[PDB]
Amino acid sequence: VSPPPPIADEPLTVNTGIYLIECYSLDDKAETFKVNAFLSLSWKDRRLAFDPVRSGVRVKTYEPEAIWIPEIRFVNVENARDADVVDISVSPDGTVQYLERFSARVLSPLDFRRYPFDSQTLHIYLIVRSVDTRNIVLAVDLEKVGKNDDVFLTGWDIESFTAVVKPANFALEDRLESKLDYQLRISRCYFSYIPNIILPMLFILFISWTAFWSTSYEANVTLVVSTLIAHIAFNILVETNLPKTPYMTYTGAIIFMIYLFYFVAVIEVTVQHYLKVESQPARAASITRASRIAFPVVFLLANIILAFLFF
Amino acid sequence: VSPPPPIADEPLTVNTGIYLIECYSLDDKAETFKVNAFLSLSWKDRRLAFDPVRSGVRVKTYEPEAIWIPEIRFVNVENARDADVVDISVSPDGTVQYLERFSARVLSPLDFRRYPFDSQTLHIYLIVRSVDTRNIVLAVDLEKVGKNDDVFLTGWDIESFTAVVKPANFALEDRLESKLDYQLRISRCYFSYIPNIILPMLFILFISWTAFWSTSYEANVTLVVSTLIAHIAFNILVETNLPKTPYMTYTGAIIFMIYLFYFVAVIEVTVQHYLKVESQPARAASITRASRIAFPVVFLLANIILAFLFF
Amino acid sequence: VSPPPPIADEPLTVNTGIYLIECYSLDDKAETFKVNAFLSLSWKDRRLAFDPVRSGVRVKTYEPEAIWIPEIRFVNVENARDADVVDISVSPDGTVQYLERFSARVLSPLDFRRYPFDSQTLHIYLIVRSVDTRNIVLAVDLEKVGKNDDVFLTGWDIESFTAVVKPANFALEDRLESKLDYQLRISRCYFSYIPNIILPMLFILFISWTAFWSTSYEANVTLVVSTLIAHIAFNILVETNLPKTPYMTYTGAIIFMIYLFYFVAVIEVTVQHYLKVESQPARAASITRASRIAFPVVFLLANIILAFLFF
Amino acid sequence: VSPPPPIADEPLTVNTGIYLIECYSLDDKAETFKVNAFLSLSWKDRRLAFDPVRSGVRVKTYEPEAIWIPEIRFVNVENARDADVVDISVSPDGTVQYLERFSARVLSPLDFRRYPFDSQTLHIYLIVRSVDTRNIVLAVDLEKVGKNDDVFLTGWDIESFTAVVKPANFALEDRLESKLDYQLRISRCYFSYIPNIILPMLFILFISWTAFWSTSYEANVTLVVSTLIAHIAFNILVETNLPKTPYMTYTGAIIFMIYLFYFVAVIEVTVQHYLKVESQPARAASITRASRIAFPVVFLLANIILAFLFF
Amino acid sequence: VSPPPPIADEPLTVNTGIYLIECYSLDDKAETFKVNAFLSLSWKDRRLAFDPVRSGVRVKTYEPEAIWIPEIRFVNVENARDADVVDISVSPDGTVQYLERFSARVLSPLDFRRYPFDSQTLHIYLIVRSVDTRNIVLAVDLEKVGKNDDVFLTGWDIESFTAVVKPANFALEDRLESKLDYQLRISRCYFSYIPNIILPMLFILFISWTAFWSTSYEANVTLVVSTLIAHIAFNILVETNLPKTPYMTYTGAIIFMIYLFYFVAVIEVTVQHYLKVESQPARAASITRASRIAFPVVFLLANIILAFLFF
């Protein structure tokens, strides 16, 4: 079987359509997600045309081996998909209606800079490579693009599944390739963020600041250094929840500024003590009492600096 | 091979039956479980009917390629199943008795809000897609739905394996699909919660409260801050046992309220000290002595608030 | 090829035999072990009988496709085995001697209640499903059941590999199945428990008890609370060695009772201090001095309670 | 099919070309990376030559089985690649144009001595083994060597993909092999190095040095030993980011020297105390005051020693 | 195709040869290593003999399916190898020269008692099972046994790859098997052990001993108990580097004895305090001053006891 010969000089249009049955295994670290879907392809091969009256039937069904079928592939997949052909139907004019169910692991890049208020745009790129006998381009049948309502990705909200209708047609290793962009949009979700990461990290930070209602260098050193251990040990506890990136994220910045407020708290505590033992308990107490409004306010305003920086 | 032609206008009934041989690899995080089972299918194709007298035999056995067999598929599977056909038997009337042994990884959503007293309902969804020549619906042979007695899922109690007999018949990409719901019910199980998570976490919390039988700001700061480290380090130790969810669970709420009781204990300790060094040891001692009934009672009642909130 | 017709009304005996070549990958968590072995099957198909004189040969060798061979399967495997047929030999009477080398991942349940003095019984269950034309039962050729001497499972002692000769014959989805139990016994092994888990955990516990040779509430609070952190951090260190079960184990009980001895030590320390600051240093000292024989003795006797409870 | 016979005594040239479609799964620990690419091969087999006029066609397409095709293999792969032949085209002169899409896991050694300013050179080694009837050598078509612009490796910058045009021709197990070196260059990237590993580790180190503005052996011991715990716990937190190597890295040296500055700080603190309690508070204070310029300066200069050692 | 008939009653010699191309993925825990190599086999099948003059060619090449080829297998592999036949060459006399490239995961037992100065002997065991028609033995072609110079195993030194030429011929399940031992000798390598495990663990241990230049029970308790936490937290940090074995290793013994020196340090500190508060500061100071030479010397000598015990 050859590809269908062209009527004029025109290339062959294949009408694509992905319907998401399941989506699962978004690996935030590997920048992958697994998907289980229908792929529908449709084109016109007039070599397969027939008379519905003389053949007796409205629709002819073939096996994949029997007829010509285009080699459609995914670009951004790890390995080629687990495909199973569901149905091949040819109408009287020669219009082939192909359908397969596939499952593929997909590499779409992720951006965690606004964690845990980030949203993502997952791509599924479909290509077809043209042949020597005829050129092939993809098109999108927008009625055959959708998703099951049961489609769930725990800890995200699946907003929308579409495709960009204009395919990207381009030359590669001396032949025309036609690429299509199918986009799954999603938006994050971590109702427990505040009680699982933020609130206990604010509490351990506030505990360090009770050293501004105290003058014991021995109690203060225990307060500030022991709660710094408590902070690091807590960061250890929530390490699994936080994104491990080579760049700075929003939650990551909050964390960093907290390590800074531990450093500045120690400076104060050391200064307050150096002034009191250096017989200036006037200036010593003036600083420690100022820190009690200075630290919380500077914290709140810097957090507004960050918030506004990222959003 | 086409599907069997209909006698009247009726659709084709396939009689389904899943018998669980093994169940294993419930991944609480990925919301999957692996299963190894028999799938039995049964329908009537009168094109395969024969005379037992003239054929000489009572039952004819075919190969899968030889005869028409419906394309049954699972909905909520990662990849299509590892199927091995066990037996195909056709009786004189044309009744096909199909049997295969499969193993599949399955995506059923899990709800840990009532951890570790949660129960689950694992779904295995069977579909069949109807064809142009004839409509197909699934039915359930409830005598062929069951499970091996050896079937174990460590840390759960396998309660029941059934199917919802009314199939869900619906149109999808222009054809009728017939869906079936097979439900594995399970219920959790963790005797170690009481002896592995709750009791040592109550002990480390109680240790923090011995600061209400003390007036040393230096001993008290060590008591409350060191036991807060002990709490976080313990939470680290039992991190593997606890469910890593984007939502708030019951055990997770207990944990959170404990981080709050550390914060409130520090407030008290700081206030008691601020009053004693501010020459009001009457009010200082009044508070610290009140906390000794206040803290434990508030704890017990809040835990009853939580308990009743979740149950 | 059909199954061999019966001489009388008798069912077909297949003579089984597993010889373990390697065993490896015991996953204590997943309750699996991998195995690499020979499976030998032997039955009589008199349709394959021949005259050694007229055929010219002593033994005829066939290909698997050529002759009838029973569908033997494992029950408690994740996926069906990686089988490679080694030899098929038919003697003049029609006795088929089949041999294959397989490797399979196996689900046998494990019991860690007596960790690290537990022993296990790993099952490999062989089934055969009878057919419409004839009934099939398994038998054990005990000369063809054994294990290579190199067979090693690091951290255990491979005691014995046998089979229970009486097969379990039973009806399943309307046909007779014949099941066989092959048992690999194993017994645990951990000299490092004493020098890796128990001894450093007794040392950190004893360190907490030097607070009975002291009256400083500040040193005592540091001793008991700091060593409790040391205990939890050590439990973290040996978390990989200890079994993560939903039930209580023997080592797990020892651990739990140690968390209790930290709680009781804190009670004492708090009471001793409350009596001394409440001007009763007679009773204060009486208790602290009694704890010095009370604690170690109660520990030793409770450990004998536990020991005897589990053994 | 034999290899094409030589015109003269010359060997057969195959023109190679790898175009990277995706690259992913760089395992820093295992020294692997996965890749998905096109491999293009081109040679002249004049046995396949044809007359475009009499054959009627400009280009003949064959199946892999039909014609002779060289066994090209990768050297440094774990398992042989997942190859799928995309197109085989023969022009009138007998020039075969082969194209396949493969995905392979690759073992290229990595050097982390200059972490996190290291750059890498990933190799993909192509071999062909010559045969008895004729010698085979690889050549590089540099226009067919390239990479997709979407090719991403999170936390690195993909600089360049080329091949060394001079193939390495050599005798192995009595035959000529022709090897080619395809090099993917990459350079590291951890913009957050300073902000997540270095800065909080300098802060916890500086906190230890506030013991030079103090004379309390009890506060100083808490300062230096508690911040040493904070250092180790932080190193635990950033363990995932740091490379696990059997050799010394640059970041690893910084870490090591920090453990040394904790040791030397303790020596000082112990000496300062030993002199003050040994009634020499002149020399005691002289040392502690000197450490306040000595420690930071020695640190800065040693870090310049290291920096210059590695770069 | 049957095996070649014997000329006399002699058995068939197959000449083996493994050439290591790559070696990788030594899993210290699972006692496996992956390997990628050439396997060369050579034997005489006179059924394949030909006249070079009449056939026209000097050497005939066959496909694996075409001719008889022995079932050579590995003993100590997890799954049977990923084999790809590279070349089959038959000379005029019937001498088959087979070559395949395989990759296999291999189970060779490892001994870490002298970690990190241990050396290993990795086995690759080749078997052939004799058949009913003829006996088969393996031989070693020592010119076809070697390794690529690029062969690397990070953190080890690949010393040598040979085979024991005398095959082990033996009866198994009623037939002769011929076994061969191919040995890869490797030796460990960890310069970072001294700068990653031993030195910071000696520093944290030395810090505990500054309590012999001090008489404050409160500072001493903080010194010894806080550095014991620091020791456990550090052991946590280097847990990944250290071998997780059921037996006692050399590095493991060093670790254990360090936990003992923490226990003995606490005993001293408790005794020194009990004597000073029990008004015997003569004996109290005598002990503490003796410990300053006793502890370091006993440490050094015990480490020489260990060193000499293991080596």
Side-chain angles (χ1 to χ4, degrees), chain B residues 22 24 36 38 82 87 89 99 101 103 144 154 190-192 195-196 203 210 214 218 226 236-237, chain C residues 31 73-75 77-79 107 129 132 172-173 175 217-218 225 229 232 235-236 239 246 248 260 270:
Chain B
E22 296 296 323
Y24 49 99
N36 198 315
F38 280 145
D82 259 315
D87 185 51
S89 285
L99 192 74
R101 171 158 176 176
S103 53
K144 291 192 94 74
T154 288
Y190 185 12
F191 330 123
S192 181
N196 286 355
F203 292 172
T210 74
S214 195
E218 278 170 288
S226 291
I236 278 160
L237 185 80
Chain C
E31 284 162 291
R73 304 193 317 280
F74 290 94
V75 192
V77 285
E78 305 223 329
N79 305 74
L107 263 139
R129 193 180 165 77
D132 32 84
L172 171 51
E173 286 195 314
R175 289 269 189 76
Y217 190 67
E218 278 181 285
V225 168
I229 288 160
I232 294 162
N235 226 252
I236 279 160
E239 189 185 18
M248 191 54 70
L260 195 64
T270 303

Side-chain angles (χ1 to χ4, degrees), chain D residues 68-199:
Chain D
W68 183 84
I69 290 164
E71 297 186 343
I72 302 307
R73 307 189 316 280
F74 291 93
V75 192
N76 56 314
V77 284
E78 306 222 331
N79 307 73
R81 70 208 184 237
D82 260 314
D84 257 306
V85 183
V86 188
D87 185 52
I88 300 164
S89 286
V90 191
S91 45
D93 57 297
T95 284
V96 196
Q97 301 253 283
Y98 175 86
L99 191 73
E100 64 161 35
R101 172 157 176 176
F102 71 103
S103 53
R105 187 176 186 192
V106 193
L107 263 138
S108 198
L110 298 163
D111 187 38
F112 302 119
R113 247 166 278 271
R114 321 201 197 195
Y115 184 85
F117 306 120
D118 64 326
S119 270
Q120 306 298 337
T121 290
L122 305 166
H123 306 286
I124 308 187
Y125 293 134
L126 281 185
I127 44 147
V128 71
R129 192 180 165 77
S130 306
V131 267
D132 32 83
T133 38
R134 201 178 168 180
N135 265 33
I136 318 168
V137 309
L138 302 173
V140 194
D141 175 355
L142 263 164
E143 92 105 48
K144 291 192 93 67
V145 184
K147 82 191 89 81
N148 198 75
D149 294 300
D150 298 336
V151 168
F152 82 71
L153 207 48
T154 289
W156 301 84
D157 267 352
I158 305 94
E159 303 293 80
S160 61
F161 190 56
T162 337
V164 323
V165 297
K166 37 148 177 215
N169 292 343
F170 69 94
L172 171 52
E173 288 202 317
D174 265 75
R175 289 268 189 76
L176 189 116
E177 291 223 357
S178 182
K179 181 148 147 270
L180 268 180
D181 188 4
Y182 280 78
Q183 298 182 338
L184 183 58
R185 195 146 291 95
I186 55 165
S187 52
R188 138 129 54 56
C189 221
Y190 185 12
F191 320 111
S192 150
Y193 187 29
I194 254 83
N196 274 337
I197 292 80
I198 296 243
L199 287 195

Side-chain angles (χ1 to χ4, degrees), chain A residues 15-20 38-42 97-99 140-147 161 182, chain B residues 129 172-175:
Chain A
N15 280 301
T16 55
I18 313 178
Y19 178 89
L20 293 194
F38 279 149
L39 171 56
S40 71
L41 298 178
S42 166
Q97 301 252 288
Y98 174 85
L99 191 75
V140 194
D141 176 354
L142 262 160
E143 92 105 50
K144 291 192 93 67
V145 182
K147 82 186 92 80
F161 189 56
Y182 280 78
Chain B
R129 192 181 165 78
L172 171 51
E173 289 208 319
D174 265 74
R175 289 268 189 76

